[PDB]
Prior knowledge:
The complex is a heterotetramer of chains A (55), B (60), C (60) and D (54). With 55 residues, chain A is mainly α. Chain A is built from 1 helix and no strands. Chain A has one helix spanning 2-54. Chain B is an all-alpha fold and 60 residues long. Helices cover 97% and strands 0% of the residues of chain B. Chain B starts with a helix and ends with a helix. In chain B, 35% of the residues are buried. Chain B binds chain C through residues 3-4, 7-8, 10-11, 14-15, 17-18, 21-22, 24-25, 28-29, 31-32, 35-36, 38-39, 42-43, 45-46, 49-50, 52-53, 56-57, 59-60, and chain C through 2-4, 7-8, 10-11, 14-15, 17-18, 21-22, 24-25, 28-29, 32, 35-36, 38-39, 42-43, 45-46, 49-50, 52-53, 56-57, 59-60. Chain B: It is found in: Early endosome membrane. Chain B: May be involved in protein trafficking from the plasma membrane to the early endosome (EE) as well as in homotypic fusion of endocytic organelles. Mediates the endocytic trafficking from early endosomes to late endosomes and lysosomes.
Amino acid sequence: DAGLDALSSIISRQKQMGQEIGNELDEQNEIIDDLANLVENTDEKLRTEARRVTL
Amino acid sequence: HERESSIRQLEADIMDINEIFKDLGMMIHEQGDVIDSIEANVESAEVHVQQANQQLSRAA
Amino acid sequence: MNRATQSIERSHRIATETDQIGTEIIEELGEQRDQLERTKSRLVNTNENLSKSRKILRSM
Amino acid sequence: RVRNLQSEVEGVKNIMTQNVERILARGENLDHLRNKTEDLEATSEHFKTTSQKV
């Protein structure tokens, strides 16, 4: 009765948290993919400059 | 006892959710080490490029 | 009191702990996000520093 | 209502299970990224070394 009301409110917070976490994790995986691409490109510029140096 | 049963089963499901949070929490925390390493390799790469330019600038 | 009332109470207790684990998770992901963003900042900064490398090497 | 609570709990289990999948995926993506940063750090060492020579 009343115990279910307090419990229902608690579980209610859980759902929103669950959704916030999902949105956060999704964005972070985007950020990580973005970083992998930037690393790859920077690593290529590095290779190129190191070569020029040796020339 | 059907309402009682549904209520008791609800508890088992709430415990299961608690364990999912703990599982998610544990992995997020441990993955923190990987992120620490990623940040470190990048900071290190950054200083090396800076040190390298100091050298090239001196050779110029 | 009966099996239902006591089960509801335990669920209350467990569900509260879960919510607390939830806020802990959200806070930790926030720190990790910032760490990844700082990493990105350093990486692009380094990428631009490599353009100066090119400039110095051109003057060789 | 016990029926409502049951539905919300199933929804939470579904969302959180998907979040664990997102984290298992983030783990893979983080390891992949870490390897790339190790390659990056290695190349930067070479760059530094080669520059010290000229």
